[PDB]
Amino acid sequence: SGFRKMAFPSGKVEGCMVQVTCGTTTLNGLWLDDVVYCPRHVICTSEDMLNPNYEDLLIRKSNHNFLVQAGNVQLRVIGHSMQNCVLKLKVDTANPKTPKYKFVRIQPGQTFSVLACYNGSPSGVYQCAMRPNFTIKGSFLNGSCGSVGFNIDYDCVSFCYMHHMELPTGVHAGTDLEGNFYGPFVDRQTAQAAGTDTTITVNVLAWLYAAVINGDRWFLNRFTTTLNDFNLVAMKYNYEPLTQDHVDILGPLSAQTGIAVLDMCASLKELLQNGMNGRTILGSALLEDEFTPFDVVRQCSGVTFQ
Amino acid sequence: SGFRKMAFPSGKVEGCMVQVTCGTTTLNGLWLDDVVYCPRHVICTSEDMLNPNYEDLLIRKSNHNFLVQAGNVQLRVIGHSMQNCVLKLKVDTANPKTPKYKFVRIQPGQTFSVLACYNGSPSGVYQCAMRPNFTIKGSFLNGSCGSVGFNIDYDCVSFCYMHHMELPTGVHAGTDLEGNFYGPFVDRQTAQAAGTDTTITVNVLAWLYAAVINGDRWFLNRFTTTLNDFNLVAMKYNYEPLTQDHVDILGPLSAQTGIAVLDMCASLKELLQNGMNGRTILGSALLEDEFTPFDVVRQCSGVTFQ
Ligand SMILES: *[C@@](O)(c1nc2cc(Cl)ccc2s1)[C@H](C[C@@H]1CCNC1=O)NC(=O)[C@@H]1[C@@H]2[C@H](CN1C(=O)[C@@H](NC(=O)C(F)(F)F)C(C)(C)C)C2(C)C
Ligand SMILES: *[C@@](O)(c1nc2cc(Cl)ccc2s1)[C@H](C[C@@H]1CCNC1=O)NC(=O)[C@@H]1[C@@H]2[C@H](CN1C(=O)[C@@H](NC(=O)C(F)(F)F)C(C)(C)C)C2(C)C
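A: This is the predicted complex of the input protein with A1B7C.
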């Protein structure tokens, strides 16, 4: 029992972190096989960043200008290319600790672990959700750029996020590992704001199932609802629409607990309409939306990784 | 910016986890150099656990009865001994991934990361506090015993916790790495309850400093208080006494923000007396007590590990 915000074990990713320095600029990179992936703005000074022409800055660089360090050891760069907002540095040594891996673009509502790094060294690990507005509520300082986010499935690391920037209200934005931003953001120091965020309904329901499994059951009511009527209420409280696909994904938890999804929706509707009245669910005084159905099952069933 | 419950990177510990099987009982062990450390109740069946005589059970075992597996590979056991509630299995192979490490007994109020493991494989990592009542609010299932808790300081892993059991209300209890329990608990399946818990005052103050550093400043009032008067109020709300040592430990955060500790105490007193009135601090609707002053500084200053 118990339910915690749990991150994936970070060791497979720790073995891939390096430092990339170009001129006076240093950030983190990810070394897989013989390639180092990092934010392209390693080639910028704190003056180029107001309106940089990356293509222009890069043509004036050559391989030797990129100083890549894995711990002590310098990796010799033997090629470079830009892909969207990431640079790929081909190095002359393959990383012997490279895990089985994939690059995936995640969808809003999905979670992942972040390994926050500075100067190529890991500081800590935490779990994040890709928010509906394509930001993450991270914890990142100067020097954190090139830190990555990931999921693990058995032995395979799915890298889904590389960190680039901090927006107003202290939320974060970055790219997939092909250098395409999540959301409408650009890698330049210019006025940018996140869209209004929404609550990830399916994750809230997942977490309510987690509460039932842990014996926190006070909020279950005796009613059901239709999907349609549920969505009209959710809408008012700035919850995302619940789709049939979401219902289908909640099927395992529904089967385990014997609570139909639309019955749990009726309980959620009452929490939204009446509040929690000073009570907690799983220790929390607010409804939590950063656990996916899979996160709940993984945690409550003891799924392990290689 | 941003503030998250952040765990240490787990890789150094992942490289030390193994599976120990005795008879039909399997739990996790920790392999450092040529020793495997695990809960002594690996030698028990689900019948011996009501009132086990460990000394008696152990004398009937020999080295070969302990099946130790590191991934695929079986490690040959060449000696065994019991120390308090842990077994130490001497094996014929030194773990080549052993980090620099120490065994430490932590104090109530201190935090650490848990690497939750099943069958010798890691499932996830999260941060925990040793509660004043010597429990932790963990997330552990059947098969999690022998999972460890740890801190990292640069290159050195301080192991402070090995998991043994779950108490009523879904909280957890275990030992240091010399097999001595935290709190009054015993490794037997018998009626045991945690003492009433208390809020870790110094950690709450630490977290309020974290809020100020992140620009969440609404709760700062214009007053100060004495330590004595603060402690009379804290007492009523089941907060631990704040000592001068606690004040001294908050000195770095106080200096950084320019808010005297007793001024922050006055703000805390008002939160305790009046509540948060529906507002949040760092996204939380309750006062949080599982961040130490050091955790705040580590996270807000970007301290990294080897
Ligand atoms: C990185 O770690 C990077 N730092 C540098 C420094 C130099 Cl000289 C070159 C390239 C990089 S990448 C940080 C992480 C930030 C810092 C604070 N917290 C974080 O998460 N990234 C940045 O500094 C990026 C970088 C330029 C600006 N920037 C920002 O995050 C801006 N944000 C914005 O302008 C806004 F649009 F998002 F809001 C701030 C104001 C400095 C936080 C670029 C976007 C390329
Ligand atoms: C371990 O993983 C262990 N499991 C086994 C199984 C066998 Cl056959 C032998 C030895 C061990 S150690 C679990 C972890 C628990 C299970 C649920 N969540 C967890 O954290 N530990 C236990 O099962 C320990 C073990 C015997 C009982 N026990 C318990 O946790 C009891 N708790 C208590 O009796 C109480 F006093 F704490 F409350 C419960 C009721 C089974 C949870 C011993 C204490 C040696």
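Residues 201 and 240 of chain A are 6 Å apart (CA to CA). The domain at 198-301 of chain A is CATH 1.10.1840.10 (main proteinase (3clpro) structure, domain 3).
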